[PDB]
């Protein structure tokens, strides 16, 4: 409707992976959009302001022996 902007912290500033991505629960998910794709969501933080987010990544690369 009026056109609510709503961004992330590593889409306008420096992000770290500190927290590999992990599954989401059933509400986890549910919730989380970037547990679409992977169904795994990591911890980047921004150096700028210390902000943490929640991204997606690969586990099948992250920790797969």
């Known amino acids: ?3 609510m902007k ?3 912290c590593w889409l ?3 992000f770290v992976v500190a927290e590999e991505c992990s599954p989401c629960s ?3 998910a549910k ?3 970037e547990c679409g794709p992977t169904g795994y969501v990591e ?3 921004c150096s700028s302001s210390k902000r943490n987010e929640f ?3 690969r586990s099948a ?3 797969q022996r």
Do not use: A, D, H, W
């Open 1 to 3: 409707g009026s056109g």
């Open 6 to 8: 709503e961004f992330p």
């Open 12 to 14: 306008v500033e420096e």
């Open 26 to 28: 059933n509400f986890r």
């Open 31 to 33: 919730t989380t959009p």
């Open 43 to 45: 911890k980047i933080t």
């Open 55 to 57: 991204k997606s990544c």
């Open 61 to 63: 690369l992250m920790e």
